[PDB]
Design a protein around this ligand. Structure first.
Ligand SMILES: C=CC1=C(C)[C@@H](Cc2[nH]c(/C=C3N=C(/C=C4\NC(=O)[C@H](C)[C@H]4CC)C(C)=C\3CCC(=O)O)c(CCC(=O)O)c2C)NC1=O
Ligand SMILES: C=CC1=C(C)[C@@H](Cc2[nH]c(/C=C3N=C(/C=C4\NC(=O)[C@H](C)[C@H]4CC)C(C)=C\3CCC(=O)O)c(CCC(=O)O)c2C)NC1=O
Ligand SMILES: C=CC1=C(C)[C@@H](Cc2[nH]c(/C=C3N=C(/C=C4\NC(=O)[C@H](C)[C@H]4CC)C(C)=C\3CCC(=O)O)c(CCC(=O)O)c2C)NC1=O
Ligand SMILES: C=CC1=C(C)[C@@H](Cc2[nH]c(/C=C3N=C(/C=C4\NC(=O)[C@H](C)[C@H]4CC)C(C)=C\3CCC(=O)O)c(CCC(=O)O)c2C)NC1=O
Ligand SMILES: C=CC1=C(C)[C@@H](Cc2[nH]c(/C=C3N=C(/C=C4\NC(=O)[C@H](C)[C@H]4CC)C(C)=C\3CCC(=O)O)c(CCC(=O)O)c2C)NC1=O
Ligand SMILES: C=CC1=C(C)[C@@H](Cc2[nH]c(/C=C3N=C(/C=C4\NC(=O)[C@H](C)[C@H]4CC)C(C)=C\3CCC(=O)O)c(CCC(=O)O)c2C)NC1=O
Ligand SMILES: C=CC1=C(C)[C@@H](Cc2[nH]c(/C=C3N=C(/C=C4\NC(=O)[C@H](C)[C@H]4CC)C(C)=C\3CCC(=O)O)c(CCC(=O)O)c2C)NC1=O
Ligand SMILES: C=CC1=C(C)[C@@H](Cc2[nH]c(/C=C3N=C(/C=C4\NC(=O)[C@H](C)[C@H]4CC)C(C)=C\3CCC(=O)O)c(CCC(=O)O)c2C)NC1=O
Ligand SMILES: C=CC1=C(C)[C@@H](Cc2[nH]c(/C=C3N=C(/C=C4\NC(=O)[C@H](C)[C@H]4CC)C(C)=C\3CCC(=O)O)c(CCC(=O)O)c2C)NC1=O
Ligand SMILES: C=CC1=C(C)[C@@H](Cc2[nH]c(/C=C3N=C(/C=C4\NC(=O)[C@H](C)[C@H]4CC)C(C)=C\3CCC(=O)O)c(CCC(=O)O)c2C)NC1=O
Ligand SMILES: C=CC1=C(C)[C@@H](Cc2[nH]c(/C=C3N=C(/C=C4\NC(=O)[C@H](C)[C@H]4CC)C(C)=C\3CCC(=O)O)c(CCC(=O)O)c2C)NC1=O
Ligand SMILES: C=CC1=C(C)[C@@H](Cc2[nH]c(/C=C3N=C(/C=C4\NC(=O)[C@H](C)[C@H]4CC)C(C)=C\3CCC(=O)O)c(CCC(=O)O)c2C)NC1=O
Ligand SMILES: CCC1=C(C)/C(=C/C2=NC(=C\c3[nH]c(/C=C4\NC(=O)[C@H](C)[C@H]4CC)c(C)c3CCC(=O)O)/C(CCC(=O)O)=C2C)NC1=O
Lengths: 33, 177, 164, 207, 380, 161, 177, 177
């Protein structure tokens, strides 16, 4: 049985929005959906 | 980094003394010829582009061995790095003259510069000469004694700021030595 | 120390630029305002042995519980060290009036204060009580001039806002 | 016993240490003079030879408190690089003692500046050559112009200190003496009259 | 509990900067966080790009002939598609990063360089170096870079928009890691082409061996000597610039040292530590003369205590003062100022100053006593 | 000893020169500040004992040097040190009136460090007491005279260190 | 360097004037042909840096084992220190030419250098090859037969002067042996 | 890193010489047997998987103290790291034989390897033996004299490339020593 960590895309849905960064732009498109 | 005002504050903080009227004689005289300090810094930053190509070419027309094959200024890349070096030192010296204190010079430019050149194989003799020609240009531009550029100034004496920037340049030279 | 000088030449050093006309223009205000902000400096420096005295007992008059056993000012040497702290803070305000910025305050009184005052059970409200008592007792033509009083009160309330 | 710092004295109020650590209140002078201390140090040989033959020995032998920044023999050997050579080569000619004197006199400072005296301080003074020299030691690095002191403080006779530096300090107002050359005279009397503009040329009336 | 969380943890929702960064060396020098704002002038995009080129290449000149490589991948950031972390991922996988830091390097040097570039830290222990070596040897350089960026430690510290910076954490697990961090970044006037020796060994400065020191320090737990941490360092580029009672900056080592001065200094320090260890026990026991009488005098002073103004007429004359917390007990303005001269007045503290400075003078002399044979001496 | 006038005259005489415009510049500079100097010297003569008392109280009065084992523990040593501080204040006043620190070199600093080292007097505490005296003196005489007096106070401290 | 020539002329020396001076020995050397010796040491100090660089690159392009790992010219420190050593030897032999006498060449660098290089494990024959390369470059610069480099001199023969540095470089190469 | 073509370019750049017709006889002969060089590299990279397990197992039946408890190859992790190191050295040697120059070998593999194996406690005696068995396999595979699995080649002589790879392997061995 191999040792497989959670990938980064599996962890990018738990993030906290920060408006001062570019990460505001992904919570643009998360919101009009 | 510090300036001329905070320099006396760390001196008074070493003894828990308030800055009294004895200490402010040196600083209210720093305010009186502050316009001469701005007029002196403006003369250097105006001709700073000529000063590096003046000094590095003077350093060449003295030690041809730098443009010799295998020499330290032999490649276009190495000549560009030497011209880039000169400008950084001229930038930090003009910071120190504007601040009235040499503190920003010897923790952001000269701290660790000794090993930087030693480890690179940069020859220190020509490094001294490139700084001293820039020092000679600085005293000529502050006292308005350049050969072919004169700048408009209000009349008065300026040898104190010239001696201050001359005191910064041999600090640079003793650091790279 | 953050001042008018050390701000504009680190902004120039981070960009790799020579001192431009904005850098020279910023120091021109350091010529005008230094007539007012230095006039409060010797005024606080010469009469600093009446301000610490008048702030220290006002701190204990607001909070008489500090002299109880088990509290911060229970014995004499603790009150002696308490007056020394108000002397330290007024010395840092005297320094900040001389540099022209909040440099010495942010280096020597502000950074790390919120850990030592919680670890050693020093109540910050009793610290800001003395500074506020110094703040409202500024007779604007009698203590100093008008602009020197403005420059003094603006450094007192900065310490008040930083301690709370 | 106590006070890790005991004291001198005798009689009641004593501690067990004689007055002055040896009962000598005013002690004799054990240090030698400037040229003496240099000559026994074994490293300032060229400096002492130049001081003697130059005539500056009389200046540094005076009782006045001096701070000398004598360069080691390494410093004089390090002049064989091109840049400093081009500035000081004509000081080898036997008729150029007058400029050797000013170069040497630039190394002598009136007043006794100890190394601990200069920590985190920037001082400007005039040396015996009459030229301003800046002495600043920041972060335990002492400098005299472009000197970079290497051996801090050797005490001398009349409160004069010696700092050993690793390079020679050229004075600021120093123009190198030019090499000797043949004196030239104009060959043609008419070739020089052709060189001078006449009034009608200053007017713009002539070519 | 004076420190609540570390900086390896994600930032709390109550604090603008991390709690560790407010009272470390972070607030002092230029090693701070440069955040890209959400809409940027074409002026202030270059403020981010200059910090990136200062950090990722780790102090490199980079002529604009060497910038026309990266004019494609900077343009996706200037548009606003690339984040800052994807920009440093694209810059690490470019060829100019490769030819400078991979293409003449031993593997230890390359691993310790991208620890310093892509993160703000030194190699921590040996076990985290070996896992990255085995990550490269089976998957290549491209997956090796993603092993650094795409894990937990990048996004909890930098996020996706702060540029990397040399981290002054304050909390170091393996301790030495602070000394390795200070010896990896060599102050403001150093680079990796110079510290790696890739120019002296190179031919016309190009094609240099990117060699490395301190790989004996990674394998055996043998920590970094003090001279590479105190002389050339970010500690003095990010210094507090204040008055230290022991000055921590080393003096340059003197030429022409002798063994006689070392012998007398080594006797001096041995006298001083013996004096300190006996002056310790007497302090806080027999420190005061009016200490036995402190309990006695309190009951004599407790009489005649009155509230309002004007008392203690002492015969016919009216005037009196009292009424003051510090004054009710006879203390003056000089009573709290005696703590401000203790460095030069406390009998115990004098020994502790002169112990440390005799140690600091001692430590440089045996660095100068490492050279024997063609070494001329003087007579002081 | 030589004051500002004596120093200018000496600089002119050592070159066989007559007093030219620069000498006149320096001489006018001294003559303009002479009256302030006299005012400060009078005020300092008025309050010497209180200045020394306040400096000692703020600098070393309650430290460990006044306790058993400290330099000035006994009454002899206390009196000797207050006499030393009186010397320093009086000579700083002389130097301020003269506008030249040569009297400090000739009458005070010559062989002082060696005497203190032979006696065992702590130099740092002495410099600290002189610094505290500088505060009180500048306080009492105002800003300009305080700057003038602090020049010679710092001269003494540098010559002692 | 500076004290190589006597320069007797002094005014009010009070030790020198009205006292005996090196008139018999110092003066004759200076009169006899010191201009040739001065063009000589100028032709060394204007070419010195290219000389040590070309020398160590000629040694390395003859023997690559020093630049191999395990070699003495590997590591950041060795390249820097070996360049420094070769230039120091050049500076001392330039002084020994300028003095016309090889005493300080013994006393300040050649005294106990071989045992130092044995204690450091420095290979000797490579340094002998280096100083022979410097000897060839020195006599090439002294005959003005540099194929790459030109200075103008007053016309004449400097053959006697050229041998001088060959004897000095052979003294170095034998003392290291 | 360099190759056989650029090796003569840094040799000519040391004297500012153009690469003339004398220099190109060594390089046009490098082109003539370039097909033999590709045919020699292809024979090594074909059996490179057998070569490591051949050499490391030979080093084990040399010395059973490596698989002894506490030995350097005692753990599966340590045996995998030794098989990993064998392959890295065989990879860089095949790089150097393909390039015709040993430059990529001793700044990417051998620079800093000796003090690494000293700091790890890796025994150097067995490190020499694991490299020498791989060298013996290399000369057998280039000259087509392997006990098992011969390879098809055009007829001709190949001892020059075999001597070149034998010259690379003792460079590796002298580096790790
Ligand atoms: C933290 C939680 C977490 C997970 C649940 C997994 C799931 C997961 N799988 C893939 C990626 C994939 N996942 C699958 C899986 C499948 N395709 C099929 O037809 C089957 C139904 C199923 C296997 C049973 C395949 C085939 C890919 C590869 C797609 C590709 O390579 O193009 C990816 C994208 C990253 C990548 O490309 O590898 C993720 C996030 N990984 C995680 O990190
Ligand atoms: C923060 C402060 C700061 C500086 C002061 C400079 C100085 C500096 N220059 C170089 C690098 C260099 N510096 C020089 C300079 C010179 N060589 C000479 O012979 C002349 C004496 C002198 C020019 C006048 C050269 C030629 C190189 C290139 C060396 C090489 O490419 O091998 C390096 C190493 C990085 C690099 O390779 O570019 C540094 C740190 N840069 C900085 O960031
Ligand atoms: C052998 C090679 C060689 C050179 C390349 C030049 C370069 C050069 N110029 C100056 C000396 C100077 N150099 C400058 C620089 C400049 N002057 C200007 O008017 C411009 C603004 C700017 C360059 C465009 C200045 C201002 C001085 C002072 C004197 C003057 O020009 O008025 C010096 C130092 C003193 C001197 O030697 O004159 C040198 C080495 N001279 C040389 O001997
Ligand atoms: C924002 C940009 C900015 C500046 C550039 C300076 C500009 C400046 N310089 C001076 C004014 C002056 N500048 C000089 C300086 C000199 N004169 C000489 O003959 C020497 C060559 C040189 C010495 C270095 C002198 C002597 C004065 C007049 C004295 C003084 O005002 O202090 C003044 C006051 C006079 C006036 O113009 O009203 C000003 C505003 N100030 C600024 O706010
Ligand atoms: C360095 C700056 C500086 C100041 C801020 C003041 C500060 C100040 N003034 C007073 C002391 C005083 N302060 C005032 C002033 C006032 N009383 C009022 O009711 C009004 C609000 C205000 C005038 C408008 C008066 C009238 C006294 C004397 C009586 C009293 O304490 O109220 C005291 C108490 C100790 C003392 O008597 O000196 C202090 C600390 N003085 C200074 O030197
Ligand atoms: C440079 C800036 C600077 C400061 C601001 C102070 C801050 C400070 N105060 C104390 C220490 C103390 N500080 C106080 C002060 C007070 N307690 C109270 O209830 C009141 C709020 C206040 C008096 C008005 C007391 C009573 C102690 C003793 C606490 C203890 O010893 O545990 C300490 C611990 C070491 C010491 O005893 O000095 C420090 C660092 N010190 C400094 O060096
Ligand atoms: C992983 C293990 C680990 C530790 C053990 C600590 C220890 C530690 N302390 C400091 C840093 C410091 N440490 C001290 C501590 C002291 N000084 C004294 O006089 C006292 C004897 C002692 C407190 C009791 C002080 C005063 C500083 C600050 C120095 C400064 O700011 O210049 C630093 C450098 C980083 C920094 O500047 O903050 C480190 C690594 N931190 C760690 O991460
Ligand atoms: C493969 C490696 C390799 C090298 C790096 C060069 C190195 C080199 N240069 C010279 C030889 C020389 N080197 C110089 C030195 C210089 N010429 C100048 O014009 C500059 C000012 C200065 C620095 C470049 C001189 C003047 C000569 C003699 C003339 C000549 O042969 O070119 C010699 C011959 C010395 C001898 O043994 O007689 C060698 C080996 N040659 C090589 O075979
Ligand atoms: C007054 C005259 C004088 C000198 C000539 C040098 C001589 C000298 N060189 C070295 C030291 C050294 N010298 C060399 C030089 C070389 N190694 C080689 O393989 C080449 C043959 C040669 C360069 C061309 C090297 C590589 C070291 C460092 C050895 C080491 O790393 O320990 C040392 C030991 C101190 C040190 O390590 O720096 C000394 C005393 N020093 C002096 O004071
Ligand atoms: C302080 C710096 C300084 C110098 C550099 C020399 C420069 C110099 N050289 C000579 C003069 C000369 N220099 C030489 C030397 C040579 N001629 C050659 O063709 C050979 C290459 C080389 C042999 C080494 C000769 C042969 C003469 C003419 C005879 C003589 O005066 O010695 C002269 C006198 C005539 C003239 O002005 O030209 C001078 C001033 N003298 C100095 O004072
Ligand atoms: C870029 C070039 C490069 C190399 C050459 C290798 C070599 C190498 N091997 C090891 C690490 C090792 N190397 C060996 C190898 C051996 N021990 C023996 O007894 C045998 C003689 C030999 C196998 C034939 C072993 C056993 C370890 C593991 C040591 C341990 O785990 O404690 C390490 C330290 C990292 C680690 O722990 O894995 C390195 C750098 N790796 C590289 O990246
Ligand atoms: C004591 C333990 C011990 C061993 C484990 C073997 C391992 C071994 N084989 C060879 C010698 C060799 N080893 C190989 C390697 C291989 N041969 C092949 O045909 C395959 C392609 C590949 C492994 C699958 C080759 C090609 C030779 C050369 C001779 C030949 O096999 O034709 C050598 C060196 C010379 C020799 O000793 O023979 C050793 C130590 N021999 C031993 O003495
Ligand atoms: C005009 C210039 C001048 C000065 C200054 C001077 C000083 C001087 N100070 C002395 C002693 C002294 N000086 C001090 C002073 C101090 N103790 C401390 O702790 C303090 C730091 C310091 C006071 C600030 C003490 C305590 C002694 C007595 C030493 C003893 O009795 O052993 C003595 C010994 C003479 C005696 O008292 O019998 C001289 C000669 N002489 C001069 O000619």
């Amino acid at each position: 049985v191999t040792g497989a960590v959670s990938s980064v895309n599996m962890r990018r849905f738990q993030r906290v929005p920060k408006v001062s960064g570019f990460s505001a732009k992904v919570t643009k498109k998360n919101v009009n959906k | 980094m510090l300036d001329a005002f905070s320099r006396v504050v760390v001196n008074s903080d070493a003894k828990a003394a308030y800055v009294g009227g004895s200490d402010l004689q040196a600083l209210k005289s720093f305010i009186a010829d502050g316009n001469k300090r701005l007029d002196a810094v403006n003369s250097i930053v105006s001709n700073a582009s000529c000063m590096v190509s003046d000094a590095v070419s003077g350093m060449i027309c003295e030690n041809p061995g730098l443009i010799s094959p295998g020499g330290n200024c032999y490649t276009n890349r190495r000549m560009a790095a030497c011209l880039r070096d000169g400008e950084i030192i001229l930038r930090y010296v003009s910071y120190a003259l504007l601040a009235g204190d040499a503190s920003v010079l010897e923790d952001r430019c000269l701290n660790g510069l000794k090993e930087t050149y030693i480890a690179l194989g940069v020859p220190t003799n020509s490094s001294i000469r490139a700084v001293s020609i820039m020092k000679a240009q600085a005293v000529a531009f502050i006292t308005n004694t350049a050969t072919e550029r004169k700048m408009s100034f209000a009349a008065g004496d300026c040898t104190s700021l010239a001696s201050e920037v001359a005191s910064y340049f041999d600090r640079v030279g003793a650091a790279i030595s | 120390m953050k001042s008018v000088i050390t701000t504009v030449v680190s902004a120039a050093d981070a960009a790799g630029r020579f001192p431009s006309n904005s850098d020279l223009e910023s120091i021109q205000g350091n010529i005008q305002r230094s007539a007012a902000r230095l006039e409060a400096a010797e005024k606080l420096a010469g009469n600093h042995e009446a301000v610490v005295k008048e702030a220290g007992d006002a701190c204990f008059a607001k909070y008489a519980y500090l002299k109880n056993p088990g509290e911060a000012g229970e014995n004499q040497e603790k009150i002696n060290k308490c007056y020394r702290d108000v002397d330290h803070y007024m010395r840092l305000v005297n320094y900040c009036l001389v540099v022209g910025g909040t440099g010495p305050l942010d280096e020597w009184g502000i950074a790390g204060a919120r850990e030592v005052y919680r670890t050693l059970n020093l109540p910050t409200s009793a610290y800001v009580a003395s500074i506020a008592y110094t703040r409202d007792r500024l007779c604007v033509p009698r203590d100093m001039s008008a602009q020197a009083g403005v420059e003094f009160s603006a450094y007192l309330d900065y310490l008040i806002n930083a301690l709370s | 016993a106590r006070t890790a710092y005991p004291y001198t004295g005798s009689g009641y109020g004593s501690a067990g240490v004689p007055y002055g650590q040896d009962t000598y209140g005013y002690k004799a002078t054990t240090a030698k003079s400037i040229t003496e201390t240099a000559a026994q140090a074994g490293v300032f040989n060229t400096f002492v030879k130049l001081l003697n033959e130059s005539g500056v020995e009389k200046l540094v032998e005076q009782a006045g408190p001096y701070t000398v920044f004598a360069p080691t023999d390494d410093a004089f050997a390090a002049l064989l690089e091109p840049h400093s050579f081009n500035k000081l080569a004509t000081l080898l000619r036997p008729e150029n003692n007058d400029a050797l004197r000013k170069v040497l006199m630039h190394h002598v400072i009136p007043g006794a500046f100890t190394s601990a005296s200069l920590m985190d301080r920037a001082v400007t003074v005039k040396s015996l050559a009459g030229e301003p020299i800046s002495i600043m030691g920041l972060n335990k690095l002492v400098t005299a112009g472009t000197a970079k002191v290497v051996r801090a403080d050797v005490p001398c006779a009349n409160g004069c200190i010696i700092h050993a530096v690793s390079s020679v300090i050229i004075p600021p107002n120093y123009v190198p003496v030019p090499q000797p050359t043949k004196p030239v005279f104009p060959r043609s009397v008419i070739a020089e009259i052709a060189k001078l503009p006449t009034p009608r040329q200053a007017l713009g009336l002539d070519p | 509990k004076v420190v609540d969380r570390l900086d390896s943890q994600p930032s709390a929702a109550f604090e603008q900067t991390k709690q560790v960064y407010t009272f470390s060396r972070y607030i002092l020098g230029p090693h701070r966080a440069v955040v890209a704002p959400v809409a940027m002038d074409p002026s202030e995009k270059e403020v981010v790009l200059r910090a990136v080129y200062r950090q990722v290449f780790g102090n490199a000149y980079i002529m604009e002939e060497e910038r026309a490589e990266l004019r494609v991948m900077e343009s996706q950031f200037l548009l606003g598609e690339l984040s800052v972390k994807e920009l440093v991922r694209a810059l690490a996988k470019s060829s100019t990063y490769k030819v400078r830091f991979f293409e003449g390097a031993v593997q230890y040097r390359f691993i310790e360089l991208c620890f310093k570039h892509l993160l703000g830290r030194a190699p921590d222990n040996h076990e985290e170096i070996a896992v990255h070596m085995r990550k490269y040897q089976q998957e290549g350089y491209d997956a090796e870079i993603d092993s650094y960026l795409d894990a937990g430690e990048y996004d909890n510290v930098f996020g996706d928009d702060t540029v990397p910076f040399l981290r002054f954490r304050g909390v170091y697990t393996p301790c030495d890691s602070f000394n390795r961090q200070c010896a990896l970044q060599g102050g403001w006037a150093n680079s990796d082409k110079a510290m790696g020796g890739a120019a002296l060994s190179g031919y016309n400065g190009s094609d240099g061996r990117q060699m490395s020191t301190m790989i004996g320090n990674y394998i055996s737990g043998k920590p970094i000597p003090y001279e590479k941490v105190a002389a050339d360092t970010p500690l003095k580029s990010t210094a507090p610039n204040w008055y230290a009672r022991p000055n921590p900056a080393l003096a340059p080592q003197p030429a022409y040292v002798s063994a006689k001065e070392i012998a007398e200094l080594r006797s001096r320090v041995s006298k001083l530590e013996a004096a300190w260890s006996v002056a310790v026990k007497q302090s806080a026991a027999a420190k005061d003369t009016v200490e036995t009488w402190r309990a006695a005098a309190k009951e004599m002073a407790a009489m005649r205590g009155i509230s309002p103004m004007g008392e203690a007429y002492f015969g016919g004359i009216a005037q009196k003062v009292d009424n003051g917390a510090l004054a009710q007990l006879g203390n003056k303005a000089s009573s709290y100022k005696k703590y401000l001269y203790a460095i030069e007045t406390d009998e115990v503290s004098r020994l502790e100053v002169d112990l440390e400075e005799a140690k600091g003078q001692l430590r440089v002399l045996e660095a100068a006593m490492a050279k024997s044979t063609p070494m001329t001496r003087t007579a002081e | 000893m030589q004051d500002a006038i004596t120093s200018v005259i000496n600089a002119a005489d050592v070159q066989g020169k007559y007093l030219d415009a620069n000498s006149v510049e320096k001489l006018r500079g001294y003559f303009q500040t002479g009256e302030l100097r006299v005012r400060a010297a009078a005020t300092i003569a008025a309050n010497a004992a209180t200045i020394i008392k306040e400096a000692v109280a703020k600098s070393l009065l309650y430290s460990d040097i006044t306790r058993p084992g400290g330099n000035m523990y006994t009454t002899r040593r206390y009196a000797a040190c207050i006499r030393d501080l009186d010397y320093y204040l009086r000579y700083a006043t002389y130097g301020m009136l003269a506008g030249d620190p040569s009297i400090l070199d000739e009458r005070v600093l010559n062989g002082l460090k060696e005497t203190y080292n032979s006696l065992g007097v702590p130099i740092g505490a002495t410099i600290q007491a002189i610094q505290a005296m500088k505060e009180v003196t500048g306080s009492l005489v105002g800003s300009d005279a305080g700057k003038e007096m602090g020049l010679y106070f710092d001269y003494i401290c540098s010559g002692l260190s």
